[PDB]
Write a protein that binds this DNA or RNA. Structure first.
Ligand SMILES: [K+]
Ligand SMILES: [K+]
Ligand SMILES: [K+]
Ligand SMILES: [K+]
Ligand SMILES: [K+]
Ligand SMILES: [K+]
Ligand SMILES: [Mg+2]
Ligand SMILES: [Mg+2]
Ligand SMILES: [Mg+2]
Ligand SMILES: [Mg+2]
Ligand SMILES: [Mg+2]
Ligand SMILES: [Mg+2]
Ligand SMILES: [Mg+2]
Ligand SMILES: [Mg+2]
Ligand SMILES: [Mg+2]
Ligand SMILES: [Mg+2]
Ligand SMILES: [Mg+2]
Ligand SMILES: [Mg+2]
Ligand SMILES: [Mg+2]
Ligand SMILES: [Mg+2]
Ligand SMILES: [Mg+2]
Ligand SMILES: [Mg+2]
Ligand SMILES: [Mg+2]
Ligand SMILES: [Mg+2]
Ligand SMILES: [Mg+2]
Ligand SMILES: [Mg+2]
Ligand SMILES: [Mg+2]
Ligand SMILES: [Mg+2]
Ligand SMILES: [Mg+2]
Ligand SMILES: [Mg+2]
Ligand SMILES: [Mg+2]
Ligand SMILES: [Mg+2]
Ligand SMILES: [Mg+2]
Ligand SMILES: [Mg+2]
Ligand SMILES: [Mg+2]
Ligand SMILES: [Mg+2]
Ligand SMILES: [Mg+2]
Ligand SMILES: [Mg+2]
Ligand SMILES: [Mg+2]
Ligand SMILES: [Mg+2]
Lengths: 88, 119, 101, 73
RNA sequence: GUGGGAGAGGGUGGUGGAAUUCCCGGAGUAGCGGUGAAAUGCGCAGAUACCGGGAGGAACGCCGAUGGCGAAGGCAGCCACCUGGUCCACCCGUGACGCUGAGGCGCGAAAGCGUGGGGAGCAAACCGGAUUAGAUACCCGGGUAGUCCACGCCCUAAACGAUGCGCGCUAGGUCUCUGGGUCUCCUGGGGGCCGAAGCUAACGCGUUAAGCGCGCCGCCUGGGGAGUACGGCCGCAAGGC
């Protein structure tokens, strides 16, 4: 799974400031963690389609944010991406 | 000849015949009877009366071995199943105790088409 | 690291010598996987509700160890190897849900 | 009509999650080794559901029956 | 975000007991089985009925509920690991980041197809027995594919609430599942029923709308010919759109 510690690390490592828990960055970050944890899971259990549905739903929720982030501050965008190592 | 005077009386009722098997205190059969063992041949074997005769026949056949008391084991829901108990009670043999031990799966094999549906 | 309850039923015909060996082989593997015995309850033996391994009784053990999940299954399967070990039932420890209290 | 007393009321505080208390668990099985209904156990849905689980555990351990023979008849 | 919750939601491995069949041993003997009645069939190479042992496959009694979970298909023994959804409390963070969704892509009961494996029970076809005016049927005795597993296809359905998704608004009563509370009762999420207003051809619907409204998608335009022909796209084929 993912423990508070793990969860907390990434949150901190990404908060735009102390206490920042729900910023576009924090979320995108947190989301990426799940997606990756879940992505690895599916490579092993390829028949667990149900979980896969979640995946598409996260990947899509992530798009929504990044798509937003980029339209508001194309910098924190190229930034958030770079850090997380996303895009293409 | 072997003398036992105490054993099991297994009744096997079904909608098509009744059949009693009497055994030693260890389950080994001493004698048996059924609707066919008695005169009946067609559907009369499943008759409650048939059961009676069949039961009684086996009781006698067992009495011959000194059998005096027996435990009863019921199986199935055939007609003349109680008549089989009833008989064994009045068969001189002392009925120590009745116990229904009909098998029932916890759901295993698909029943014959004739036996399908639930709830 | 999670708390688990490792239930184990043993051959009800082991002499003080045999019981002891098997019983230690248990302690052994527990380590080899990552257990940390927190408490035991060698309830000894009781009359089984049905014959297990052809016996009407069983020697029941118990432990409330703590260990690394990734091993649990792997560990338990090991414990089953022994011939005198007829039952290995591990359960994630839980908060006693009371009732009629 | 499921008359008589309720298996719960007729008992003290117990851990509905303890699959080893053969003495109290045993109380919830019928004459046969069958798990009694809410109508009889006097439990709540949530409780009953936890019972079923624990009872099933005790059965697999050897502590409880899966089915018994009907006496008398 | 934090703290809590219920669940047969999914994947993987492992494991338990009941039953059927088969094989081994004991005991035992003349039938069993089956039907409206029968016969086919099985049994003195010893069956049926009973006890002990072993093997194997498939499915999970009671719990079980008008219950729960899931987007649908669908999901029920127990344990572990891996994993999705969702609900509540606190008002902590972001600051409209929202809704819908042509095409695409993924999923998608059963039967069916390919390759390998498995095969207890069941059972299309088929082989018999009955029945009947006949009986390519219903009933009975058999039995192959298949039903099971892996992997890849197939993409349908009374795939149904025959009711697209989201949001706001408009009496209540009552039972229920699952949270929170100052725990009659209050508040939130879900499942039922009856019903205010209203709606509806009628039946009915009625805070889980079929009411009052807005957004977006899909679909309809008399019956037969026809889900056919042709073209295309897909599929190994059956065949699908
Ligand atoms: K209680
Ligand atoms: K004959
Ligand atoms: K979860
Ligand atoms: K074939
Ligand atoms: K009306
Ligand atoms: K065509
Ligand atoms: Mg939380
Ligand atoms: Mg489940
Ligand atoms: Mg034999
Ligand atoms: Mg012999
Ligand atoms: Mg012959
Ligand atoms: Mg001869
Ligand atoms: Mg047989
Ligand atoms: Mg085999
Ligand atoms: Mg639904
Ligand atoms: Mg359905
Ligand atoms: Mg705030
Ligand atoms: Mg601000
Ligand atoms: Mg959409
Ligand atoms: Mg399909
Ligand atoms: Mg199939
Ligand atoms: Mg195939
Ligand atoms: Mg094959
Ligand atoms: Mg058959
Ligand atoms: Mg003819
Ligand atoms: Mg047939
Ligand atoms: Mg497949
Ligand atoms: Mg329906
Ligand atoms: Mg209501
Ligand atoms: Mg409600
Ligand atoms: Mg409610
Ligand atoms: Mg419902
Ligand atoms: Mg109504
Ligand atoms: Mg009105
Ligand atoms: Mg509405
Ligand atoms: Mg159309
Ligand atoms: Mg026309
Ligand atoms: Mg026309
Ligand atoms: Mg037309
Ligand atoms: Mg068609």
């Amino acid at each position: 799974p993912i423990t508070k510690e793990e969860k907390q690390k990434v949150i901190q490592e990404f908060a735009r400031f102390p206490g920042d828990t729900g910023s576009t960055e924090v979320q995108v970050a947190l989301l990426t963690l799940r997606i990756n944890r879940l992505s690895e899971h599916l490579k092993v259990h390829k028949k667990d389609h149900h979980s896969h549905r979640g995946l598409l739903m996260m990947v899509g929720q992530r798009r929504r944010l990044l798509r937003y982030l980029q339209r508001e501050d194309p910098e924190r965008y190229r930034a958030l991406i770079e850090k997380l190592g996303i895009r293409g | 000849k072997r003398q036992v005077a105490s054993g099991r009386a297994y009744i096997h009722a079904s909608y098509n015949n009744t059949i009693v098997t009497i055994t030693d205190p260890d389950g080994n059969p001493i004698t048996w009877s059924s609707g066919g063992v008695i005169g009946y041949k067609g559907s009369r074997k499943g008759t409650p009366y048939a059961a009676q005769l069949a039961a009684l026949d086996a009781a006698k056949k067992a009495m011959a071995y000194g059998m005096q008391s027996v435990d009863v084991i019921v199986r199935g829901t055939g007609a003349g199943r109680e008549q089989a108990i009833r008989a064994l009670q009045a068969s001189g043999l002392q009925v120590k105790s009745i116990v229904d031990d009909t098998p029932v799966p916890h759901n295993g094999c698909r029943p014959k088409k004739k036996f399908r549906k639930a709830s | 690291m999670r708390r688990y309850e490792v239930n184990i039923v043993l051959n009800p015909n082991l002499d003080q010598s045999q019981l002891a060996l098997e019983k230690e082989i248990i302690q052994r593997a527990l380590e080899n996987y990552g257990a940390r015995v927190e408490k035991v309850e060698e309830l000894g033996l009781r009359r089984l509700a049905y014959p297990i391994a052809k016996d009407p009784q069983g020697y029941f053990l118990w432990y409330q160890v703590e260990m690394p999940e990734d091993r649990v299954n792997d560990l338990a399967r090991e414990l089953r190897i022994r011939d005198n070990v007829r039952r290995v039932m591990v359960v994630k420890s839980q908060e006693p849900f009371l009732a009629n209290a | 009509p499921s008359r008589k007393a309720k298996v719960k009321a007729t008992l003290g505080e117990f851990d509905l999650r303890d699959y080893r208390n053969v003495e109290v668990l045993k109380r919830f099985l019928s004459e046969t080794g069958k798990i009694l209904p809410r109508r009889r156990t006097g439990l709540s849905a949530k409780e009953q559901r936890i019972l079923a689980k624990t009872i099933k555990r005790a059965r697999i351990l050897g502590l409880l029956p899966f089915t018994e023979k009907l006496v008398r008849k």
